[PDB]
Amino acid sequence: NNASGKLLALDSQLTNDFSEKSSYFQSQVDKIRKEAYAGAAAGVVAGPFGLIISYSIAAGVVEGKLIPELKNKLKSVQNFFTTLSNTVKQANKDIDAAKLKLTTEIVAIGEIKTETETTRFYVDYDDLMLSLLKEAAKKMINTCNEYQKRH
Amino acid sequence: VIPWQTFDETIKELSRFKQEYSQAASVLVGDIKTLLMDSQDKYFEATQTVYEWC
């Protein structure tokens, strides 16, 4: 029960921090573009040659190498998020199946313990030829053989 | 001429609010989950004991 709550507390933090990284990405790309196209405006210290040879470097390097690499890194983060969400979703199914497997066996053992206690109380009449104790023992034999057939 | 530092401070403040309250709510919901599973285990034990007596 403790791990089944820690797993949910991890899953909700994951699904919030993925969106707060996906907004940080768009807030940072615009900063890269601001710095590039603001530093490239200092090519007015030369003539018209020194302006185009700065805007060509800026709009080539930033728009051809730095933005698609960040988009590929964001795609890798998305694939990681999907994989870890599937891992959490599988761990929940494993825990629930184990708990159901244990409770079914508790009920199946109780179905034997009821008849065992009933026969134990039927012994206390001090009459071994009592037909009710004979029928209870014949019921316990069938119950024990049907338990042993299952395991 | 372009106020970028105030823009960054505003973005970081509005992100820190959400980070703080996600971190605060996740632990409490994960504790309520554990309590709701322990209650179901106690309920099963009590009803099975009464059924086995009956």
Residue numbers in the entry:
A (entry chain B): 142 to 292
B (entry chain A): 34 to 87
Paper's wording?
Here we report the cryo-EM structures of ClyA pore complexes in the presence of n-Dodecyl-β-D-Maltoside (DDM) as dodecamer, tridecamer, and tetradecamer at the resolution of 2.8 Å, 3.2 Å and 4.3 Å, respectively.
Soluble ClyA monomer was previously found to assemble into a 13-meric pore complex in the presence of DDM, but a dodecamer was observed in the crystal structure. Two top view images (or bottom view, as they cannot be differentiated) clearly indicated the presence of both dodecamer and tridecamer. Based on the particle numbers of total particles and those used in final 3D reconstructions, the majority of the complexes were 12-meric, representing approximately 80% of all particles, while only 11% were 13-meric. These observations confirm the existence of 13-metric ClyA pore complexes, albeit at a low concentration in this preparation. Final 3D reconstruction resulted in EM density maps of the dodecamer, the tridecamer and the tetradecamer at the resolution of 2.8 Å, 3.2 Å and 4.3 Å, respectively. The near-atomic resolution maps of the dodecamer and the tridecamer allowed reasonable model building with accurate side chain assignments. The interaction paradigm remains highly conserved in the tridecamer, suggesting a single protomer-protomer interaction mode in the ClyA pore complexes. The protomer-protomer interaction paradigm in the dodecamer applies also to the tridecamer, and probably the tetradecamer.
